[PDB]
Amino acid sequence: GGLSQLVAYGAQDVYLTGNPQITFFKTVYRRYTNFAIESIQQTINGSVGFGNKVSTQISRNGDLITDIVVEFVLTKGGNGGTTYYPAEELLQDVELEIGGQRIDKHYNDWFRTYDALFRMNDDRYNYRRMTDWVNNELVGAQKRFYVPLIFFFNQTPGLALPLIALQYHEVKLYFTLASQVQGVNYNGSSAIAGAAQPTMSVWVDYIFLDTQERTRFAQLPHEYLIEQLQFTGSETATPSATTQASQNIRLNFNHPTKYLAWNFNNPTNYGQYTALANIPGACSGAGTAAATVTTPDYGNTGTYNEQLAVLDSAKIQLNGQDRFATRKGSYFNKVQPYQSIGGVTPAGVYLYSFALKPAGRQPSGTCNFSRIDNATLSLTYKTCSIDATSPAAVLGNTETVTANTATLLTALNIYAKNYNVLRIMSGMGGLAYA
Amino acid sequence: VGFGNKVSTQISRNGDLITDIVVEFVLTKGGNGGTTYYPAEELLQDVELEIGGQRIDKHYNDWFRTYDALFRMNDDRYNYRRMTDWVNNELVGAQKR
Amino acid sequence: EIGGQRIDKHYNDWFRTYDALFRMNDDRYNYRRMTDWVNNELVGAQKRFYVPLIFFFNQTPGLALPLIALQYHEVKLYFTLASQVQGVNYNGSSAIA
Amino acid sequence: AGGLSQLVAYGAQDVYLTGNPQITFFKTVYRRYTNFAIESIQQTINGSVGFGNKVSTQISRNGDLITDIVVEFVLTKGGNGGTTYYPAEELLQDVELEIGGQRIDKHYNDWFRTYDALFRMNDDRYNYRRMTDWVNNELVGAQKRFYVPLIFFFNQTPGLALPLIALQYHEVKLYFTLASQVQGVNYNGSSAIAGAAQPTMSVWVDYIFLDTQERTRFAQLPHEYLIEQLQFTGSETATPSATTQASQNIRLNFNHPTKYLAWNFNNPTNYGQYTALANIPGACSGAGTAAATVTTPDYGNTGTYNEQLAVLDSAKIQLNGQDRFATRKGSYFNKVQPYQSIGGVTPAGVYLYSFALKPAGRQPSGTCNFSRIDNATLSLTYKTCSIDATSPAAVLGNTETVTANTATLLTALNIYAKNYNVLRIMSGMGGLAYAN
Amino acid sequence: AGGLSQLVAYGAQDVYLTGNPQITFFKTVYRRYTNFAIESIQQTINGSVGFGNKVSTQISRNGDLITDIVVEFVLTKGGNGGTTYYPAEELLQDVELEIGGQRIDKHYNDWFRTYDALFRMNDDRYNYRRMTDWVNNELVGAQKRFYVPLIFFFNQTPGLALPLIALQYHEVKLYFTLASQVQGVNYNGSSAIAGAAQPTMSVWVDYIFLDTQERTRFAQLPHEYLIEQLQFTGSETATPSATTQASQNIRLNFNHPTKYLAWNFNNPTNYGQYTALANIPGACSGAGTAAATVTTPDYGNTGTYNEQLAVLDSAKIQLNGQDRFATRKGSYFNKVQPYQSIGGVTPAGVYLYSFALKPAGRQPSGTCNFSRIDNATLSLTYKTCSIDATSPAAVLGNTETVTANTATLLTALNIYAKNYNVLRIMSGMGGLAYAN
Amino acid sequence: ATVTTPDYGNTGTYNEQLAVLDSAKIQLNGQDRFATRKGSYFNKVQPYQSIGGVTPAGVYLYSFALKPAGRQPSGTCNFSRIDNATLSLTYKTCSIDATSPAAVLGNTETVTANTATLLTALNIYAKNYNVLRIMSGMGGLAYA
Amino acid sequence: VGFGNKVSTQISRNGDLITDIVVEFVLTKGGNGGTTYYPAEELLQDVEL
Amino acid sequence: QSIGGVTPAGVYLYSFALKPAGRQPSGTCNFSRIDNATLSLTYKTCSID
Amino acid sequence: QPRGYAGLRPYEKNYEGIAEADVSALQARYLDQTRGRPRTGDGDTEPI
Amino acid sequence: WIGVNTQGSSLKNANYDLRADPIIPKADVGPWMMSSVDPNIYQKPLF
């Protein structure tokens, strides 16, 4: 049996097993510090409702904080298929403030873009179960959604924010709730009579440290290498059915950037990054007589069908020099994620990494835009020649074209993720670089 | 071995260390597709591990189901399901290991 | 197997081949008497058969395994029973009800 | 090439076989030996020979040592082929060996049959049969000279040649009892055969002639010869029944280091019948046809390997109330024991249990000393005799634990034990070394 | 209880078996041996092979030592099953062994038949028959390859491997004579078979390849091999009459320390026929039915154990006018001698008388030195050939002193003697120590 | 008579005409170990010379030992030191009509019954000598 | 375990000394009340120590 | 094992003692040193008419 | 001989299996005492 | 291991009566039949 393999040994094995360093059959576990984790509700200041601004202050219950989950309770304003990640749409934005300094900020669209690029498999599925209705629920159904935040300290304990080391500084979360949420209080442009206002609660998971560890955090200076989001909105060089639109955007970005990400969208419909079409799932009623290529099948707003995307090609130019050769939109949609993330990105969402592994915590190559005068994103759009109401026109067409309904994707959202340092000393914190 | 029976085995001292253990079963379908649910997992009601006569641990069919429900995922979970159930619409009389 | 180490392995066909070559005369006839029905027995007949093993220690006292010198090693035999036995549970390809 | 391709295939795995070689196979050494010759000499029988008569002979010191002894008999068939079964063996009812007046040993016609059943084999067995029976379909009136070799310890090997030369003041005598009846020769079952002839008999001894110095050493030096002896008691059987499995516990009144026990169950009136009669080929007179009678054997085919006609279900030897070995089935004693210890085939109804590794040789190889057992016993369980012997289907298709209704006729049990003793010869005299 | 109960039962009588033990049965130590390899190498045949031809082969010096030699033949059947009897054995009429131009030995087809009749047995004998005859009811036109192993002293044991290596200046050759006719192959009795194939032949020698040290010693050292030789003379038989008992005194022109004598009576017309023909099953062509004749044998069943068809009533061997042993009956030589000395079964018409304890072996065990005996004579008494061979009752029911009238056809007598001599090899040359 | 099913009680036979091996040789390290011999040589002669028993047709033996049936080493082929070892077989032509008795019984050396084609499996066995070392309560084979 | 079978156990070293030993059996009646007599006793043909 | 009498159905005993029926203090189970001694029961299905 | 030993088809001298005791040694007792009462441990000793 | 012999080779010729027999020391009187039976002396007799 197995012995016949052990004896099969010679010079070619020496590089693999000679003077062996490790085994696999005995693990040394590392003794760790003594700690405990508790989920504690924060008080929401202000008034919760659609379109309102509320805020919360994180209470000093524990020593460090990590995960933050914002609970929302919404009721369906219509039947199954009318909503799309509505809890995500609702949390329009969240701003992180430490010591009165703006540290970071996320947007509903970022949560959608981020998810589209970085979550995957059953992480992504379980993730949707917490922000949408995915079991064919009907009008009036009530659900509590759990929207995790994705600030640096909300992703790893390694960057738990040491509130204990911030005795003098408040840590606050400022939230903007959307004026409308699709399939909840509005249906496209129409209001839904009788829709309920949201119930909201913010939960913070706090780490309790024992004496030696707590003391070190409280007294020692720290430098936490964290990530931040940069974001600007732009008008899209709106696609046309007659030609190929083009655009060159100087990006007002800074800091060592692990990656850029972007999408084109129809601001009317949360998560719509692609054109509408009369092909199954691509529009409300798609595939039948009732199909309308003016309204999405909200429950199926996102798609992997690149025919409905609008980016033909793109490049990033730095101070007049090409950073890389121009690549097709499908490179940025399918290859980049293959190489850098290992997940599957929806059509209309694009990524370009400067990092070997942008999805991780450890720096693995960055582009420092603080040293670049003219960082320009060059975008070439597809020609919107396809009659979206004819599935044959869509499904049988060429690489350089898209749906006539693709011209509705008039908004452009460009994101960048970078590294910075959150310095903490003598009970206070703030960023090393602006 | 049979339904409702308690059986046991002593692990043979053939190698130096042991890791993975797989229990094989051969089951047949007593009805059509849609009638079973992880039947090999259901069948193995529980397993108790003993060293030198001392209990070390014990798993239950329900635990296997709970464990799977919580800790396996994606294609690991599907591949697991393939190893304990009939998932290609097999019919009555079908035999599977 | 000794101490978990495989020492040897024989097959029904080996016993037949071995016999065909190395046994003889009345030892062979008696062997046949211990493994078959040689007196024109009929259906339903019952007999106890004795199949001696042919491992080295089963051939001479000179090689008797020293269980006494194997204080830490077991001597074990493993057997596989045939899926079918001709004229006992099957007749060529047919099962015998 | 050729064979050299094998010689060059040499390495560490060969050292245990050929390194520092001790022997070769391609040059043998024969040992030089003494100068001796073998002469076959007729001895004088003292007494009348006939059926039921008892005679004796004294072996003359014609040579120095004696080995083989052959008793010649001449019989005429009292019926046709198929009516006799080893009749010269049956005829010599028994033989006693006496040295110095001490009884050294004794063999019985049945022992010769049991011994043969267990220890002779193949052509050795057939050739033996050719010297004691009619095996070429001879007919009534056919005359044949039979040779019955004796099986006393000095008849087994030159190595135990009896040193008559060293027994100057003691005589060696054999006593032979001739059976009152021999089947198919002077009686057919219970019926006397009119006109049957009385046997002609002669005893021959094969004597070893040694040279001057070899003779001197044997004549003058004391010698201790390791010999075999046969212990034997005949007894009744807990006769098998068609209604129940009979059982029996027989105290074994044995002594001495015993190599093995041997036994059989037989029909007291049919020589060599260790199995039940049946209407299956060879198992009864007329078997295979309408006239078959399961009260009389096909004498020429008395012996059989068909276990279904045997009567022992199981047996064990118990010593001082304790099991000596696990209870085994009758078929174990009949088939496996001799497979393991002898290498021949034993006929159904004949059983062996060895306390020795190689009981068929002369060299001691493990013994049970019954002189050190208070209460040895042979425990026997019999098969149920429920099978209708007149119907071959009933016989051929039956189960392990049953036998023929005619199996209850095997009422006799013969238990033998073969042991060692020492025959001490000194100053011209000799007798058995241990009394018990 | 159990085996431990036997060990504890120790007494005075165990001391002579296990006290101060010398050996154990449970620890066999095997001897390390010189490394070697065996290769079967085809030899050429000088001269076309066919019936009646004389051909020969020189053994090549391919290896160092030689043992087994097998002659292959391909024969065809000139009639159906039952028409042949050991035809490959018959075909190899003889073989001579010559070293350096001088004869060492010579074997003949009849010897191979006699040798087999006496010394092979059981399955060995059957397997041999399977290599020399057609034993599965093959039909006319059937063709197969037949093997006839040689039986010269070096062909029976590695211990006598012939040191071709030590015979650097002397060739070793085998000369073969093919029979002019072979029954059931090219002739049916006296009638030639039209279209009969001539035999294909091949001679194979098994060579031993020695390692360096063993090889060197054999090449350089002188050697002495104690070997056997076969002496043989065919002669006129005092053919039995139906009116009386023929008798004969045959001067035996034998020499050397003879191990044993052997002989047979035969009908030279029919190879292997050592007995009278008769109308009893297997004893003649068509025996048992309307077509039976006692002029032709059932060739496939030529050999028989029915002594009624044998021609020797009794015999003795005289040495210088002194009876060697008392006169014994033909069945003593046919049945008792081989029982005692070989352990196999000898067919009717074949006789053995040993001067040795173990004539079937290689180790000397008592011999008759005929080189010291002026007059060695075999004295024979024949049976009266008065039984009507065509009437099975007449044969099967006959008396000890008579045989079938057809016994008169056994006019040829073959007397053999196997003896020891020494083959000496030195300085590359060799031959025998004694000339006679 | 059906030549697709054996008389099970008489499955084995000594009738060489039903054998399927015409001839064979063993080749070691690209060179012949012995000259090719007929199937009947392996079936009848090897056993004659080395065992003294009688081997059924269809079963073959080639000994490297003088006395392979014993326990005492008497010559071995060490395949552990042979890079290449091959058994070379030649089969008989299975042209004989098995259902027509004369066709079998009266045929030649290189042919057999058409039913020979059904013997599709080949089982090759070898017996070698190793050392079982036992000491201090444990043991195993010296040469794994 | 079954009718006519020979089975055995090696007692494990769970404790230091042992006393009571009880063999459990599960049997099903092959007939009505009155047809059995101490059947678990009849079943345990023997036991060796 | 512990009493030698016969107990009616529905009444159960588990001894921590060698001889619970006697006065002598054979072995005992000290619950004053045991955190949550628990009796775990499994009931039969009451399906029979 | 033309081909030298390629070294292929190797073996390992004196390969013993894992030691398996037949005596079946007693199970090892624990090192942590039984968690009895957590707050009223070792009796109370009520007075008169 | 299996126990000493409380009887051994002594009970071959035991005393029927209860009066202890006079001990005869077995000491090879004859050079032929030696008679391996033991003496069998009573330990604590009736007296």
Swiss-Prot record, chain C:
Domain of life: Viruses
Compartmental location: Virion
Modification after translation (UniProt): Myristoylated at the C-terminus. Glycosylated; highly branched oligosaccharides. The pattern of glycosylation sites are unusual.
Induction behaviour: Expressed in the late phase of the viral replicative cycle.
Misc. comment: The viral capsid possesses up to five major capsid protein variants. They behave as asymmetric capsid components.
Stated role: Major capsid protein self-assembles to form an icosahedral capsid with a pseudo T=169 symmetry, about 190 nm in diameter, and consisting of 1680 major capsid proteins trimers. The capsid consists in 5040 copies of the major capsid protein (hexamers), 60 copies of the penton protein (pentamers) and 1800 minor capsid proteins of different types. The minor capsid proteins form a hexagonal network below the outer capsid shell, stabilizing the capsid by binding neighboring capsomers together.
Family classification: Belongs to the NCLDV major capsid protein family.
Protein name from the UniProt record: Major capsid protein
The organism of origin for this protein: Paramecium bursaria Chlorella virus 1
Positions spanned in the full protein: 99 to 195 of 437
Swiss-Prot record, chains D, E:
Post-translational modification: Myristoylated at the C-terminus.
Induction (free text): Expressed in the late phase of the viral replicative cycle.
InterPro entries listed in its UniProt record: Capsid_N (IPR031654), MCP_C (IPR007542), MCP_C_sf (IPR038519), VP_dsDNA_II (IPR016112)
UniProt keyword annotations, A-Z: Capsid protein, Glycoprotein, Late protein, Lipid-binding, Virion
Positions bearing carbohydrate: 279, 301, 398, 405
Extent of the signal sequence: none
GO cellular component, one term: viral capsid
Record flagged with keyword Iron-sulfur: no
Disulfide bond positions: none
Family of this protein: Belongs to the NCLDV major capsid protein family.
Note: The viral capsid possesses up to five major capsid protein variants. They behave as asymmetric capsid components.
Protein name per Swiss-Prot or TrEMBL: Major capsid protein
Source species of the chain: Paramecium bursaria Chlorella virus 1 (PBCV-1)
Curated annotation (Swiss-Prot), chain G:
Induction statement: Expressed in the late phase of the viral replicative cycle.
Covered residues, full protein: 50 to 98 of 437
Miscellaneous comment: The viral capsid possesses up to five major capsid protein variants. They behave as asymmetric capsid components.
Function noted in UniProt: Major capsid protein self-assembles to form an icosahedral capsid with a pseudo T=169 symmetry, about 190 nm in diameter, and consisting of 1680 major capsid proteins trimers. The capsid consists in 5040 copies of the major capsid protein (hexamers), 60 copies of the penton protein (pentamers) and 1800 minor capsid proteins of different types. The minor capsid proteins form a hexagonal network below the outer capsid shell, stabilizing the capsid by binding neighboring capsomers together.
Superkingdom classification of source: Viruses
Family label: Belongs to the NCLDV major capsid protein family.
Subcellular location: Virion
Name of this protein: Major capsid protein
Post-translational modification: Myristoylated at the C-terminus.
Swiss-Prot record, chain I:
Gene coding for it: A342L
Subcellular location(s) per record: Virion
Subunit description: Interacts with the major capsid protein.
Domain notes: The hydrophobic region might anchor the protein in the underlying inner membrane.
Designated name of the protein: Minor capsid protein P2
Top-level division of the source organism's lineage: Viruses
Coiled coil residues, start to end: none
Protein's job: One of the minor capsid proteins that constitute a network internal to the major capsid proteins and outside the lipid membrane. The minor capsid proteins glue and stabilize the capsomers. Also acts as a molecular tape measure protein that determines the size of the viral capsid.
Induction conditions: Expressed in the early-late phase of the viral replicative cycle.
